């Protein structure tokens, strides 16, 4: 039984790979110039890491990263993709006269057979909030094909978490559930479901961008080193935090973004999704507290963000947060698989 | 006395204490619409006052008696229960009108007058017209009115109209949601959120608003002071059927009133409607705890029931219904604890 | 089960997950044409419900059952297969109606009812009426209907008409021409342009539009739910012969539908036509691969063939020719994957 | 009852009506200085509470009792005379503390408490510390205090300082001069001007102010709640001799207060001084009838006599004199009828 199928509900995998089979989705991702230009720069400026080397491209989609590795001089690139996009990748490899160097291997990286070990693995394994889609585990799984000296592009990933204040976002989600307070919608009392409705809406992480002035403390960083991490490390991800509050006011939740670094032989190239940086198709992610916490400047906001992988290729998110000085505590559960796209 | 029988002593003490303050008198007198309109009603109907006997109920500083004197009254009995009666007597002497204005200290339900009067003047209107229950004292004073005497004001019109105001609703809704907190300094308050919502939404909101928030033609409820009895004001039932002109959320009902001075020379109107300059009565809005949705052309039907209480005010019951869909709203309000938002 | 034999498990999982969300219930309930017309149809035909036995197929939060209760029904069996069933149960208790509404979690093809019913109520219509294949569940439920029995809705009319929309047509190639460039970061993408075009044209466009784009009076295809059987919906052939009211280029066919509640006291209609206020069903347009020129008074004839698939939707095949000239066009579309264009 | 004999019914009615409102509880609870300081005082002196018996006098919604429970109190009697006692009970039940907090509706002068307590907690301070005459109920409750028990707060310090505020002084006459016109709609109002003036000057002004209007270091009058008897508060004679730090016109006296929680571990201070963040106690200013000129280095002497009355408040008689010149002034004010000037 493949490692992939054992961790993944089939109904989730069918939807997931159908979504990624669409050329329109490829175009959406490729037109992110920050993402595409930073990947090409990371590969081309570290060309010695690719010249005359064997490369594995995990989840290659249309194959763009494999074309970048070929531009950098790779001797051989195995491009693995499990969606039907694999067949379009083959078309581009032929139309670009790279049949001698790029070899598309359709299927899941956990189930294919690669002809040889590789010098470097390249991929775009990052989902929303970094961890969504559980692709990082496939990326890590692929290290079974990596030589001892081998490198990984990207090499590390940093998840950033910071408390924010945004009463408009909070009230927007809060009043959405207010529909269910009605004691007489067309004569029907709906209010018994108001609780369940508010929980539903607040379980959705909010995906959009925000002004960095809504952040109330320096971010906390949590780092995964892809060269050293193992698949199982991502089944349960525990991120403690202790924020030193820089402004007073209501904390409505935690904001999340991530950076990855391509640590090459010639230079390290960073790809950032921080709200201080140009927007990308990852945006940023915010998990709202069902009830905001009040904190004064100089207070400490401490707790834990716990991510439990689930069989729908995503994570159950638990956030418990505490204003230490007063003992005001907030607990929240979020379903990362189904965010609210607000942008 | 009729007054004491219907009034808790603690309420009456505070009430007449409030009206004893000259600053409160100044506040009402500086309302130029109020004072200029009353003077216009009296002076322009001077034939209803020339060489007549007048009763002024709750005269305060006495301004209306001075107006009656300017219009030619022969004798004016000015009745006032608060300590302001002594300041009014001071003004009568300083204005050399001791021969025409006779201040009688006391409650109009309790004092004695030496003769029947031709006309009664008063400012009995509180917030939403009925607050303070002064209209019953005004009506009670008709025991001193000659058989065809007049009353200034003569009639009163209460208007009510549904309104939409998401900001006002959310402001009160959000105040109450402080008690949703599961861990305020470590304490779960949420068990009291319902009670908080009740308390905040029982408060009539006294302020003014742009008329664009009104979603139907107002419905009018008329009290004819020449005809009504005290007891008519103990339980006031106001049915309403609104024909909706706009679609959206009805957050509550807005109230205002006009009074008419029906004199022999002219009728003169004093209006507190939102289409008119602001007065110290403002306008009053009763919020539904949950708004009702309605489309243009639906009818919004229900009843506003006012029951007088012994704190000189009213318990307000509003039941309303979108007839087409059966969406219903029931609400209770304490007119004596208004929220002054202006 | 009849439902499982016609439905891939992967499609059913996602389908019911979707209808488990209160936000989806909320969106449908806030469609005032939808909710208000159903209430009007039921209450104004109160003698079809007074002291009757009712079956509610796919009741969601249960609102149609509450309407049947407002109309005096003695017993209502409300069947719902998604997790929304648990929420309907809460509402039946909180509205003190456990004595009259019995919520039955499950597929109507799999549950058991204790007794036969006088009337079936349902909202089985999807996009283009037929999407979701819920009509078959509605018809299947007739095994529980008494010979006298009625159905609410009683009939459904699907309307087809030819439209001209130059801008909608050209948009497809503007999108696809993203791939028609020789050096996207060094890669020649042009070989995938044809596939990108093909992908866009297979999507029905869910949108509303101005009725002035219609070039001929609509043609109607009627399903009588009192007479139809499930298998009648596996292959739906809709012939058409449009008489062109205007000259121009025909870029596709527009779809909408009405249903009628044929009651003892009156017939009430729910219409999603572009001449009526917009509903959450919108309208649907299927483009032709190549536009067809027709002159006013010409005749545009052909067929729309809908073939049910196991993803709870239809493969759409449309063929059309202008009789006077012979110019012909086709198109194959996947109703399961509409393009939501509404703005 | 002691409370009955010192309080007119009309005043008591309105008083407990006012504190029956949850909006009033919310106002005080949302004062972070008030709420947070009480919490720190109790929590940071946990050895004063662990396994101890506690009396909470005038508990309102019950917050201090929950704090005493957080600190490990074995048992807490929470006494409240307003209808708010019913809401505190609800909160005790919802917080699963029925075993440790017992809510006693009624006046502390009239309830029966089952046993002596180790420590009394309360918030008995009104405007100017003494308004409302709650301190007497707090001291009366020491009939239930074990010998060697403690009081939280332990001491209260009222502060008096001379101030200059020309605009506040002139404002009285600008308001009264409304009456000084010969023909207000034809009526000569001028004979009431002097009465209007007198009315305004009887009112203490509740307001905050810039500390730069203060003309001398405050004089402090200390009540030690562990030693004082309730009779000590019936007549409070506060002598003062101010060493003027600035030259100018003295228009009246400013008042504020501090309280100290003198715990076994530490002492915590709650301050309403104008040098500190504003609280819902604000500050209080009593004008002299006429200003007194004083040079820096002069001494301003006199007395502030607070005479308790049956309206749960005080008559304030202030006499003051510039020693080096003999210039004297005075005023008599009704603390029950303050003018709230804050903007
Ligand atoms: C209402 O509708 C929903 O409910 C819904 C829910 C969502 O949440 C929605 C979210 C949306 N966007 C989004 O997520 N934007 C973030 C940008 C990430 C862009 N891509 C990436 N970096 N992700 C990871 C790489 C993926 C590639 O790798 C392949 N691949 C995976 N696994 C394997 C394997 N084992 N073997 C071989 N190949 C594999 C796979 O096929 C791909 O080609 C949009 C619509 C959404 C709709
Ligand atoms: C819960 O927070 C509170 O504590 C609170 C509550 C309120 O609701 C608050 C409301 C506030 N303003 C307000 O109401 N503005 C509307 C303008 C009304 C303008 N005056 C009028 N038309 N009132 C009726 C006539 C009164 C005169 O008639 C005398 N009078 C009464 N009865 C008798 C009697 N039997 N015999 C002889 N004389 C009698 C009485 O002494 C007076 O001179 C402010 C603060 C408030 C504070
Ligand atoms: C990007 O992401 C996608 O890929 C995607 C694809 C879509 O196309 C998307 C399309 C979207 N809108 C849409 O569809 N708008 C029209 C809907 C009309 C309103 N709903 C109705 N009338 N449908 C039919 C009734 C259904 C009820 O009946 C229940 N039910 C079904 N079967 C059974 C059974 N056997 N037993 C018992 N109960 C059953 C079921 O649970 C329900 O409660 C939105 C998001 C979409 C997302
Ligand atoms: C002239 O018009 C009036 O009439 C008037 C006069 C005023 O001056 C006005 C002043 C206003 N604001 C104000 O004061 N702002 C300062 C913040 C005070 C912050 N609260 C506090 N620390 N107060 C003392 C504790 C009270 C608690 O203790 C309870 N309690 C009392 N006695 C007993 C007893 N014997 N037994 C059991 N429980 C008892 C009581 O029920 C409470 O829960 C507003 C309206 C006012 C109206």
Numbering used by the authors:
A (entry chain B): 135 to 477
B (entry chain D): 136 to 477
C (entry chain A), D (entry chain C): 136 to 478
According to the publication:
Protein arginine methyltransferases (PRMTs) are important therapeutic targets, playing a crucial role in the regulation of many cellular processes and being linked to many diseases. We also report crystal structures with various PRMTs supporting the observed specificity and selectivity. On the contrary, we were able to cocrystallize the compounds in the complex with both PRMT4 and PRMT6.
All six cocrystallized compounds (12a–12c and 12f–12h) adopt an overall similar conformation in the complex with PRMT4, revealing two common anchoring platforms, the methyl 4-hydroxy-2-naphthoate and the adenosine moieties, each one occupying the same binding site on PRMT4 regardless of the different linker lengths. Depending on the length and the nature of the linker, strong hydrogens bonds are established with such frozen sites, and the number and the strength of the binding interactions of each compound appear to be correlated with the affinity and, consequently, with the IC50 value. As revealed by the crystal structures, at least a two-carbon atom long linker between the adenosine moiety and the guanidine group is required to bring the latter within the catalytic clamp formed by E258 and E267, with a three-carbon atom linker (as in compounds 12g and 12h) being even better. In addition, the trans conformation imposed by the double bond in 12h is less constrained than the one adopted by 12g (also featuring a three-carbon atom linker between the adenosine moiety and the guanidine group) and, therefore, more favorable. On the other hand, we were pleased to find out that compounds 12f–12h, featuring an increased distance between the guanidine group and the adenosine moiety, showed a remarkable and selective increase in potency against PRMT4, with a consistent gain in selectivity over six other human PRMTs. Compound 12f interacts with PRMT4 with higher affinity (KD = 25.2 nM) compared to 12g (KD = 51.7 nM) and 12h (KD = 75.9 nM).
